[PDB]
Write a protein that binds this ligand. Structure first.
Ligand SMILES: Nc1ncnc2c1ncn2[C@@H]1O[C@H](COP(=O)(O)OP(=O)(O)OP(=O)(O)O)[C@@H](O)[C@H]1O
Ligand SMILES: Nc1ncnc2c1ncn2[C@@H]1O[C@H](COP(=O)(O)OP(=O)(O)OP(=O)(O)O)[C@@H](O)[C@H]1O
Ligand SMILES: C/C1=C/C(=O)O[C@@H]2C[C@@H](CC[C@H](C)/C=C\C=C\CC1)O[C@@](O)([C@@H]1CSC(=O)N1)C2
Ligand SMILES: C/C1=C/C(=O)O[C@@H]2C[C@@H](CC[C@H](C)/C=C\C=C\CC1)O[C@@](O)([C@@H]1CSC(=O)N1)C2
Ligand SMILES: [Mg+2]
Ligand SMILES: [Mg+2]
Lengths: 361, 361
């Protein structure tokens, strides 16, 4: 009976059961086939020297499905200890995800895994119920993708979906750079991983850059040392809010401009006025990234700038937003009105891929 | 730039233009040829000799597709004299018609019609819309069939739906029976048509199959004598209501099938006791057969005498409650909002024919 939720994030894969208050398995979204079978997850990584590791998925989109399945499989078997062709199933996707993909995706569940039933939901949209909403503009900033998702009655709006190709890993990478720069090494991939945690444990969203930037060099009372695994420990200036600053500065690492709140306006201002109003006081926002301090109040103002005078702008940062996408699934999967919403072998059996094509979740 | 409305009525077809507060089209959904290329419409009518014309749409469901193909064709052209690949399209589906049938006329349409965009809905709902409601039981007492469709704010209650195969052209093959007793003709379709003409003319579902049926040996006051083509006038007694009434008596044949009102009830009953009141206080007579006057105050009895005392019950039965289906749909087909629903040429050449099973409204 128990269905299964799996947010196949670009770098992370959240997956547990239905209704389950939280995805049980949350491991690395990559695989490694022989250097000269494959392996995946922590294991996959646990074998650097002799493995050719790659993210089966790129920008929250599947590319080498081999590894992909080489995951899926590991995910029930080597992972969830459960029978595929034995449980209702839910998969997440990215906004404006290419038809044949979303279709190919299904091809495999019944085909190879003979999964009984299944469905597909936009990572976004998931996060939206994960908030108790069926309409709003979301901000699922994972490890490597970014979209502004105009939703209504729980049904999205393509033509108005701004994607800001950039995220999670960017900054992490970003950082290292502005550090190897401030006297510090780290150019091996293994070092990058160090930085991230660092990037997470410390980095924050400066309510104000300039006001903050000076202070950095002016005061200090805004930084700390780091238990570098090596043993040696170290601290960082401006950076703490410079890296996460890149978020509003798609001109911090080269890039193309625009940027977040903008691409947001540049997402809302592509949405039939009638909605706009109500699209303004509901900013949800999932994915590792969004997990920042002050990131909150920071945006609010950002927009109010563009945000016309007397308009109430409300950003909602779900304390658990890191999994909302998954958490959403957990729910919808585990629901009633959703029964008929599934896809069936009997159905997939008779039709083909195009069968999947339906309405909002 | 304009869309279309087509009521594929079991044994009839009404059509016109979205908005157009009349459907300009209404005709015989029959196809026929020489006993030994083809003849559709009332053209087929005048051929009882050379033609052995068979009707399509089988109880509301298609059957000789290749055949039905002509029906439609006969439309835009001979009839409306209009263009297909140039107007959006809407089609009434059959209340709980298989998914197989679906993608058929859907692909067929486009494929062998190159249509802009097409959508399809159950007949039973439009009729509902067609009355200012979106909830409450409806009854497509049309020609070939008569269904009981509970509706909930736009959703039908599959599980909770009833389908009775008696209707219009049902009570007819019969009428031609009851009469062979006072001794008369009416055996050939030639003669069979005359029947319905009479039915719809005189026939009525009054009230008592008793105190009413008591007036019989009684006061030979109120009866009549229709002047048939054969010039010769004819007499009729209780048959003026022995035929229609049969709906509250299947045993008139042997249908060990449920009495209408009862099925309706049955339907309402199989519904969520919560919503049951609304769908109870609401009941529509979508169907030509649903015309036998005085049928108004009638049904009330049939049911409240089963409907829990503390209530109230009304059976919305408008005048054009003979096209409500077509009418109601000729609305959906008129609204900027409707686009979000349509299935355009490109919304098919990419998503296979199964992209039509899924709606919002
Ligand atoms: N507390 C945090 N603050 C900021 N960034 C974080 C935090 N925790 C994780 N991240 C970053 O967000 C990225 C992860 O997100 P998520 O779990 O959002 O990715 P996915 O869903 O795996 O990928 P994507 O959403 O890009 O398709 C991580 O790889 C990491 O770089
Ligand atoms: N005034 C009337 N009184 C009685 N019966 C009528 C009247 N007008 C039409 N009918 C009968 O009702 C039948 C028609 O209904 P409708 O137009 O409801 O049929 P469809 O569209 O062919 O079928 P369905 O509605 O069951 O899908 C006719 O074929 C006819 O025999
Ligand atoms: C705590 C953690 C979080 C995470 O989300 O990791 C994902 C997955 C990870 C895979 C590569 C590493 C070596 C192998 C195992 C990692 C396990 C846990 C790492 O590559 C990221 O780190 C990239 C690199 S730099 C960044 O910003 N994203 C995102
Ligand atoms: C006024 C009318 C109404 C109608 O509803 O016709 C429909 C369609 C009709 C098709 C066959 C005939 C020869 C051809 C053209 C008829 C045109 C108009 C007839 O066969 C019915 O008559 C049958 C016969 S007896 C009955 O109960 N249904 C129902
Ligand atoms: Mg994500
Ligand atoms: Mg009809």
């Amino acid at each position: 009976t128990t269905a299964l939720v799996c947010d196949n994030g670009s770098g992370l894969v959240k997956a547990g059961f239905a209704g389950d208050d939280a995805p049980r398995a949350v491991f690395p979204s990559i695989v490694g086939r022989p250097r000269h079978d494959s392996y995946v997850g922590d294991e996959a990584q646990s074998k650097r020297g002799i493995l050719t590791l790659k993210y089966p998925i790129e920008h929250g989109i599947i590319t080498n499905w081999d590894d992909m399945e080489k995951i899926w499989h590991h995910t029930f078997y080597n992972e969830l200890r459960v029978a595929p062709e034995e449980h209702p199933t839910l998969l997440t996707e990215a906004p404006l995800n290419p038809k044949a993909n979303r279709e190919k995706m299904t091809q495999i569940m019944f085909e190879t895994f003979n999964v009984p039933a299944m469905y597909v939901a936009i990572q976004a949209v998931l996060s939206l119920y994960a908030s108790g909403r069926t309409t709003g503009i979301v901000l699922d900033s994972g490890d490597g993708v970014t979209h502004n998702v105009p939703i209504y009655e729980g049904y999205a709006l393509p033509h108005a979906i701004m994607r800001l190709d950039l995220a999670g890993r960017d900054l992490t990478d970003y950082l290292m750079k502005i550090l190897t720069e401030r006297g510090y090494s780290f150019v091996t991939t293994a070092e990058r991983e160090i930085v991230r945690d660092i990037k997470e444990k410390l980095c924050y969203v400066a309510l104000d850059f300039e006001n903050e930037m000076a202070t950095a060099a002016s005061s200090s009372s805004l930084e700390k040392s780091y238990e570098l695994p090596d043993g040696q420990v170290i601290t960082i200036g401006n950076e703490r809010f410079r890296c996460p600053e890149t978020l509003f500065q798609p001109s911090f690492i080269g890039m193309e401009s625009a940027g977040i709140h903008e691409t947001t306006y540049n997402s809302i201002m592509k949405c039939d006025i009638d909605i706009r109003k109500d699209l303004y006081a509901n900013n949800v926002m999932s994915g590792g990234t969004t997990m920042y301090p002050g990131i909150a109040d920071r945006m609010q103002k950002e927009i109010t700038a563009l945000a016309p005078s007397t308009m109430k702008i409300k950003i909602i940062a779900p304390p658990e937003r890191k999994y909302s996408v998954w958490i959403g699934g957990s729910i919808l999967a585990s629901l009633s009105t959703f029964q008929q919403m599934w896809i069936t072998k009997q159905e997939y059996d008779e039709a083909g891929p195009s069968i999947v094509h339906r309405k909002c979740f």
